[PDB]
A paper describes a structure:
Recently, we demonstrated that cmo5U modification requires the previously unknown metabolite carboxy-S-adenosine-L-methionine (Cx-SAM), which is generated by the CmoA-catalyzed conversion of prephenate and SAM to yield Cx-SAM and phenylpyruvate. Cx-SAM is subsequently utilized in the CmoB-catalyzed carboxymethylation of ho5U-containing tRNAs to yield the mature cmo5U-modified tRNAs, with no involvement of a mo5U intermediate. As predicted from sequence considerations, CmoB is composed of a Rossmann fold, coupled to a substrate-specific N-terminal domain of ∼100 residues that is unique to CmoB. Our biochemical, genetic and structural data demonstrate that the primary in vivo function of CmoB is as a carboxymethyl transferase in the biosynthesis of cmo5U-modified tRNAs.
Cx-SAM bound CmoB structures were determined in two crystal forms, resulting in 10 independent copies of the complex (two tetramers in one crystal form, and one dimer in the other), while the apo structure contains a single dimer in the asymmetric unit. The dimers exhibit symmetry-related interactions that recapitulate the expected tetramer. The overall fold of CmoB is essentially identical in all apo- and Cx-SAM bound structures. A total of 16 sulfate ions were modeled in the two independent copies of the apo-structure (seven at similar positions in both independent molecules and two additional sulfates unique to each of the molecules), which likely originated from the crystallization media. Of particular note are six sulfate ions, present in each independent molecule, located on the surface with positive electrostatic potential surrounding the catalytic site. One of the sulfates modeled in the apo-structure occupies a site analogous to that of the carboxyl group of theS-carboxymethyl moiety in the Cx-SAM bound structures. There are no major structural differences between the active sites of Cx-SAM bound and apo-structures, with the exception of Lys-91, which exhibits a shift of ∼4 Å. The side chain of Lys-91 contacts the S-carboxymethyl group in the Cx-SAM complex, while in the apo-structure it interacts with the backbone carbonyl of Gly130 and the sulfate that mimics the S-carboxymethyl moiety. Tyr-200 and Arg-315 also interact with this same sulfate ion in the apo-structure. The side chain of Lys-91 exhibits conformational plasticity, interacting with the active site sulfate anion and a main chain carbonyl in the apo-structure.
Numbering used by the authors: 2 to 34, 37 to 323
């Protein structure tokens, strides 16, 4: 797409120095990135609608004054469905209700009471997927939410939702991997949910997260864990819950220790929860394999491979 809106936005704020690296990286990505033509076309064929009623606080919902025609709704439906799989959500957009694989609204509600007041903050969502959580952040009072995700489809999905939200400029998605960033040190709060178990180097992931935070900034870390003490860390084989390159699944206490090791303070384990099939499952918007498929049919306490079932922790830390 044209990131000139975003470059122009940070040129006049505390992220201006990101222009020293960002535009060159996007320029490289725009070259390298067949299915994208089909996904990006789906976004362009979508209508430009300005929400008459918008709710970013209790969900991500958009309404028109008078309902849309059954034909324009069908257009949105079949266009949005071209961007499957839809994993993080849900979105309610002019009656089109995108029920995503994840009930990310649950995880948001559970995480929120533990967060520092988002009001006025500038935030980085690492591996943001669809960008669902960023819209919630705007609703909770965040000034600016930036997500990064190198998956091409998530960019189209977020821009799709953006243009259905009236080209809202308060959230953005940049097709970068967290590796590619310098030490920006400019975000009040960094979220890293669903990313750590995918990193070859877990400590360097945590340092790289710290490098994006202002002093006394907040880190919200969410990832897969197992049960155990400080010394308990699983590294799975070829597949874990059918995922191909999973590296480190520590216990939450292990993770707590890791955050301390990397220079974080006031580290709180804010929640540990088994992932259930009510939170993650197949929908009309995500139809391929999901959690129930990943579990041992005769023991939901285990994956299909033998490992303990998906369990997710939420840690919160402060950068001194």
């Amino acid at each position: 797409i044209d990131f000139g809106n975003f470059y122009s936005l940070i040129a006049k704020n505390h992220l201006s120095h990101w222009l020293e690296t960002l535009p060159a990286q996007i320029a490289n990505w725009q070259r390298e990135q067949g299915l994208f033509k089909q996904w990006s076309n789906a976004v362009e064929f979508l209508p430009e609608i300005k929400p008459y009623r918008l709710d970013l606080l209790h969900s991500v919902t958009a309404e028109s004054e008078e309902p849309l025609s059954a034909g324009q709704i069908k257009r949105i439906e079949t266009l949005m469905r071209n961007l499957m799989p839809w994993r993080k959500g849900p979105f309610s957009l002019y009656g089109v209700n995108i029920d995503t694989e994840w009930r990310s609204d649950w995880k948001w509600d559970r995480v929120l009471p533990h967060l520092s007041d988002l009001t006025g903050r500038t935030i980085l969502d690492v591996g943001c997927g669809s960008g669902y959580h960023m819209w919630r952040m705007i609703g909770a009072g965040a000034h600016l939410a930036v997500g990064i995700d190198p998956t091409q489809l998530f960019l189209c999905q977020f821009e799709a939702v953006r243009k259905l939200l009236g080209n809202d400029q308060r959230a953005h998605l940049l097709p970068l991997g967290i590796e590619q960033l310098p030490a920006l040190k400019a975000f009040d709060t960094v979220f890293s949910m669903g990313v750590l178990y995918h990193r070859r180097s877990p400590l360097e992931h945590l340092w790289q997260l710290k490098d994006q935070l202002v002093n006394e900034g907040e880190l919200v870390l969410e990832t897969l864990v197992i049960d155990g003490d400080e010394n308990t860390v699983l590294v799975p084989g070829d597949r874990y819950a059918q995922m191909r390159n999973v590296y480190f699944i520590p216990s939450a206490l292990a993770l707590k220790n890791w955050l301390k090791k990397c220079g974080f303070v006031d580290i709180r384990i804010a929640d540990v929860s088994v992932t259930t099939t009510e939170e993650q499952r197949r929908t009309e918007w995500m139809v391929t394999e999901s959690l129930a498929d990943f579990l041992d049919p005769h023991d939901p306490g285990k994956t299909v491979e033998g490992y303990p079932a998906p369990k997710r922790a939420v840690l919160i830390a402060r950068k001194p």
